[PDB]
């Protein structure tokens, strides 16, 4: 496929893989299937998942670090909104939020040190 090489997209690639590594169950790897979860959009305005984040990255739809981060935060916040607290999914989203926070803090520092956050 096409492949764009800029320092910012290089950083987003690394950061994204670092985030996905924290989702040990691959719970967030793909869109929630609306065909199996027909009430999902009743609750969720903008679904997000890591496959979609990767495609956004590669298309140059993230132009700054904030916008990338906002989509990671959606993954988490959507999951916490839709699923009940006692579910494995909710609990997975809490773990992801806390581990991903550290990843994003480090990466943002790098984006700022380069002229690119």
């Amino acid at each position: 496929g096409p492949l764009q090489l800029t320092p910012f997209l290089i950083l987003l690639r690394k950061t994204l893989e670092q985030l996905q590594e924290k989702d040990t169950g691959n719970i967030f790897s793909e869109p929630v299937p609306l065909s199996e979860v027909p009430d999902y959009l009743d609750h969720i305005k903008k679904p997000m998942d890591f496959f979609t984040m990767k495609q956004n990255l590669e298309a140059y739809r993230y132009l700054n670090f904030d916008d990338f981060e906002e989509d990671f935060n959606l993954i988490v916040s959507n999951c916490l909104k839709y699923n009940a607290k006692d579910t494995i999914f909710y609990r997975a989203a809490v773990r992801l939020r806390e581990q991903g926070g550290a990843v994003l803090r480090q990466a943002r520092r790098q984006a700022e040190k380069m002229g690119i956050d």
């Binding site: 199996e36 979860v37 839709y82 999914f89």
Partner: peptide, 10 residues
């Protein structure tokens, strides 16, 4: 929350 995704029981 909504109806729930299968396979979520802890």
């Amino acid at each position: 929350s909504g109806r729930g995704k299968q396979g979520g029981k802890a």
